[PDB]
Write a protein that binds this ligand. Sequence first.
Ligand code: HEC
Ligand code: HEC
Ligand code: HEC
Ligand code: HEC
Ligand code: HEC
Ligand code: HEC
Ligand code: HEC
Ligand code: HEC
Ligand code: HEC
Ligand code: HEC
Ligand SMILES: [Ca+2]
Ligand SMILES: [Ca+2]
Ligand SMILES: [Ca+2]
Ligand SMILES: [Ca+2]
Ligand SMILES: [Ca+2]
Length: 626
Amino acid sequence: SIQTLNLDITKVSYENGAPMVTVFATNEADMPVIGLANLEIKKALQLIPEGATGPGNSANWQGLGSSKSYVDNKNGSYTFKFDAFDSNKVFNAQLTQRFNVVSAAGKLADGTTVPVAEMVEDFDGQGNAPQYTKNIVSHEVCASCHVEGEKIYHQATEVETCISCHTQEFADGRGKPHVAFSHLIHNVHNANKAWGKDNKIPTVAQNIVQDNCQVCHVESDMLTEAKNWSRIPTMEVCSSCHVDIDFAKGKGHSQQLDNSNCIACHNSDWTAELHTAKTTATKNLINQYGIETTSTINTETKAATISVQVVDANGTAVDLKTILPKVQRLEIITNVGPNNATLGYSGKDSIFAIKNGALDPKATINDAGKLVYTTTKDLKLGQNGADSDTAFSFVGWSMCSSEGKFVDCADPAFDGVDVTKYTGMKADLAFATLSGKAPSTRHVDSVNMTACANCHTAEFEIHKGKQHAGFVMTEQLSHTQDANGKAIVGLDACVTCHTPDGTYSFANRGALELKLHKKHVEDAYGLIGGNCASCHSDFNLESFKKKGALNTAAAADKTGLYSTPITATCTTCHTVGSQYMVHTKETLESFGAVVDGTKDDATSAAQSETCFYCHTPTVADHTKVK
Ligand code: HEC
Ligand code: HEC
Ligand code: HEC
Ligand code: HEC
Ligand code: HEC
Ligand code: HEC
Ligand code: HEC
Ligand code: HEC
Ligand code: HEC
Ligand code: HEC
Ligand SMILES: [Ca+2]
Ligand SMILES: [Ca+2]
Ligand SMILES: [Ca+2]
Ligand SMILES: [Ca+2]
Ligand SMILES: [Ca+2]
C-alpha cells in the first residue's frame, strides 16, 4: 500500500533535560502517515571531534542511549521521550548531537502495509542545526551492489545505521578493534584477511570491489567530510586491508605508537592518487581510441564484409597501420537473426583478424586505413524468416599496454593470460542485410549495461583473458534511446556467441536468455536474490513471439536438448524436478511446453506455451499470477 516511508526529525527540545524528539512521517505522496507501531530512536549519539582523543585520530560517535517510548500525535508526527537518557553521564551540549531513527516494516491498524525506513539527522546541543559533522559516505553507494531496502548482512538496511552502532566506543567496550565500522567495512570486502567466526575469506567481494575506494568514497557537496578517506590516515583503518604491518613492533613498517605522524608522510594527494592510479590509468587508455564499424552483404555471394575504422578520442580517423604494432587482438564474430540467432555457436563466423601486431591473412588494411574482413562461414541469410535477413557482427579488441602507456606487442605468441600486459578497448556492433532493406535489431529495452556497470564498473573488460580481447561495452554499439533520449548500451551483441543453441557445449545454458540468470543466481545470490530490478527495468514479454527453441541440457550422447522459450527462461532458476519448481514435467507439457526435448519439437511448439495466461510477471513482482 505505502511505497516509500519518509521520516524527518522536525524538532528537538532539551528544555526538560533529556531531549524530546519529534518525527514526522510521510508516504510517497507526502501525505502524513498515522499509526506507526514500530518507530524507534535506535541510537542517540554525540560527536567527539577529530583529534580530541589524540593527535591524528578520527572523530567518534559517543553513545547516549535509545528509546521506543513515543506518542502518536495523530497527524503524522510522533514525539519521543527517553526514560534513561545518557546513562553514562557524558552528555555535552557543545557537541553535535545525532539521532538514528528506524521504522520496521509492518502494518498500520487498518492493515496498510508499511515498508522499512531508516535515517539519521544531526543537531547542535540545543536542537538547532549542527556546527560540525562527520559525513563521509551516504547510504546510496551501498545500493549500487546490495539490494536497497533489504538488510546488508544483518540489523539494518542503510549504512548510517551501521555506523551509528559500530562505533569506536562499541569496539573498545568489546575489546574488538576490528568491529569498529571504519575497520569492518574494508575488512569484509578485502581478501587479505578473513572475518567472522566462519573465517570467511572475502574472495567474491574482493573480485568485485577490487579495493576501488571510489565505489564508496564519492566527492559530494552534501558530505563535507568526504575527503576523509585520504585525509585521515590511522593505523586502525589502514590496517583493515594492510593486515601484515605491526606498527607497535616496527614490522613491515617503521614503529608508530599512535597516529600523530601518519598525515605528515602520507599526504592526502599521495594516498588518493596511489589507490586510484590503476583504474584511472586503464580508463584513460580505454578512452584514447574508438572504432566505427560497418558491414555489407554481397548480394551474390551472401557473405558479409566488415570494415573497422579506428578513431581517436575526438572521433578523428586513425589509419590502423599507424597503431597495428600495438594491437594485441581484434576479433570479429558474426551471427544471423538478431532476435533469434540461427547459426549456433559452432556455425558462427569468427576470426582473430589481428593477434599481437600481426594481421591474419584473411584480413587486410585498405588504402583508407580501415581493416577489412569478409566472412567465410555459410551465413544462411534468409533461410529462417524475415529476421534471418540480418547479419550482426561483434568486434572486440585490445591494445598492448604497460603502466598506463600503450606499448608495442613485442611477443607474437603472447597468450593473453597476463592481463597486466594489455587493455580491452571499446567494442562495436554492425548490421547488414541480404535484401538491402533496413536491418532488424534485438530489443534492448529491458536490460542494459548501466545495470551491469553498477557492480562491475563502466570499464568492465568482459571475457578478457586467454580466450578474448575483452569487450568494453559503450555507446559505440548503441542503436536506440530510452524515453528520455539517453542512448541505450544493450547486450544484444553478446548473442553472437550466446545463441539459442548454447555456447561451446550443450550443457552450459549458454543462450543469453539463460546465461546471465544462471551465473548470478549461482554466484551473486547474496547480493541479488530474486531482485530482478538489479538488472531489469522491465520484462519484454513480447520478445518471446520472436524466439524459437532454447537449448537447456545435453543428451547423454552429448547432443543438444531444447525447451520451449518461456519454460527455458523460467527453469534456469526453477529447475524441473527440484524443490524450486512446483510444476512437474507433465504439467508443463500440458501447458504446451517442451522440456529438454529435441530442437525440432521445441521449435514446433515454441509459440504453444500458455504460461502467460496465468503468469503476469513485473519486475516489481515476477511471481505474480491471477
Ligand atoms: C549485466 C547484465 C551484468 C553482466 C553482463 C555481468 N554482470 Fe555480474 N557478477 C556479480 C558477482 C557478485 C559475480 C561473481 C564474481 C566472483 O565470483 O568472483 C559476477 C560475475 C559475473 C561475470 C563472471 C566474470 C567475472 O569477471 O566475474 C560476468 C561476465 C558478469 N558477472 C557479467 C555481480 C553482479 C551484480 C551484483 C548486484 C550486478 C547487477 C551484475 N553482476 C550485472 C552483470
Ligand atoms: C559493489 C562495488 C559493492 C559496493 C558498492 C558495496 N558492496 Fe558490500 N559486498 C559486495 C560484494 C560482491 C560482497 C560479497 C558478497 C558475498 O556473497 O560474498 C559484499 C559483502 C559485504 C558484506 C559482508 C556480508 C557478506 O555478504 O559477505 C558487508 C557487511 C557489506 N558488503 C556491506 C556493504 C556496505 C555497508 C556498503 C556501503 C558502504 C557496501 N557493502 C557497498 C559488493 C559491494
Ligand atoms: C547494533 C544496534 C548494530 C547495528 C545497527 C549493526 N550491527 Fe553489525 N554487529 C553488531 C554486533 C553486536 C556484532 C557482533 C560483534 C562481536 O562482538 O563480534 C556485529 C557484527 C557484525 C559483523 C561481523 C564483523 C566481524 O565479525 O568481524 C558484520 C560484518 C556486521 N556486523 C555488519 C553490519 C552492517 C553492514 C550493518 C548495517 C546494515 C550493521 N552491522 C549494523 C551490532 C550492530
Ligand atoms: C565501500 C565498500 C568502501 C570502500 C570500497 C572503501 N571504503 Fe573507506 N569507508 C567506507 C565506510 C562506510 C567508512 C566509514 C565512514 C564513517 O562515517 O564512519 C569508511 C571510512 C574510511 C576511512 C576513515 C576516515 C576517518 O574519518 O577516520 C578511511 C581512511 C578510508 N575509509 C579509506 C579508504 C580507502 C583508502 C579506500 C580505497 C583503498 C576505501 N576507504 C574504500 C566504505 C568504503
Ligand atoms: C583496502 C580497501 C585498502 C585500504 C583500507 C587501504 N589500502 Fe593502501 N593499498 C591497498 C591496495 C589494493 C594497494 C596496492 C595498490 C596498487 O595499485 O599498487 C595499496 C597500497 C598502498 C601503499 C603503497 C604500497 C606500499 O608498499 O607502501 C601505501 C603507502 C598505502 N596503500 C597506504 C595506505 C594508507 C595510508 C591507508 C589508510 C588511509 C590505506 N593504504 C588503506 C588497499 C587498501
Ligand atoms: C614517514 C616517517 C612515515 C610515517 C610517519 C608514516 N608512514 Fe606509513 N609509510 C611510509 C613509507 C615511505 C611507506 C612505503 C611507501 C611505498 O610505496 O612502498 C609506508 C607504507 C605504509 C603503508 C603500506 C604498507 C604496504 O603496503 O606494505 C601503510 C598502510 C602505512 N604506511 C600506514 C601508515 C600509518 C597508519 C601511519 C601512522 C600510524 C604511517 N603510515 C606513518 C612512511 C611513513
Ligand atoms: C564468443 C566470442 C562470446 C561472446 C561474444 C560473448 N561470450 Fe560470454 N561466454 C562465452 C563462452 C565460450 C563462455 C563459457 C561457456 C558458457 O556458456 O558458460 C561464456 C560465458 C559467459 C558467462 C558465464 C561466466 C563466465 O564463464 O565468464 C557470462 C555471464 C557471459 N558469458 C556473458 C557475456 C556477455 C554479457 C557478453 C556480451 C558483452 C558475452 N558473454 C559475449 C563466449 C562469448
Ligand atoms: C542480471 C544478472 C539479471 C538479473 C538479476 C535478472 N536478469 Fe533477466 N535477463 C538478463 C539478461 C542479460 C537477459 C537477456 C536479454 C536478451 O536480449 O536476451 C534477460 C532476459 C530475461 C527475460 C526475457 C525477456 C526480456 O526482457 O529479455 C525474462 C522474462 C527475464 N530475464 C526474467 C527475469 C526475472 C524474472 C528475474 C528476477 C528473478 C531476472 N530476469 C533477473 C539479466 C538478468
Ligand atoms: C533467476 C534469475 C530466476 C528466474 C529466471 C525466474 N525466477 Fe521465479 N523466483 C526466483 C527466486 C530466487 C524466487 C524466490 C524463491 C523463494 O522462496 O524465495 C522465485 C519465486 C517465484 C515464484 C513464487 C514461488 C512459488 O513457489 O511459486 C513464482 C510464481 C515464480 N518465481 C515464477 C517465475 C516465472 C513464471 C519465471 C519465468 C518468467 C521465473 N519465475 C523466472 C528466481 C527466478
Ligand atoms: C495457471 C493454470 C498456470 C499456468 C498456465 C502456468 N502456471 Fe506456473 N504457476 C501457477 C501457480 C498458481 C504457481 C504458484 C504461485 C505461488 O505463488 O505459489 C506457479 C508457479 C510457477 C513457478 C514458480 C515455481 C516455484 O518457485 O516452485 C514457475 C517458475 C512457473 N510457474 C512457470 C510456469 C511456466 C514455464 C508455465 C508455462 C509452461 C506456467 N508456469 C504456466 C499457475 C500457472
Ligand atoms: Ca529535520
Ligand atoms: Ca533512509
Ligand atoms: Ca578482510
Ligand atoms: Ca558503432
Ligand atoms: Ca500460440
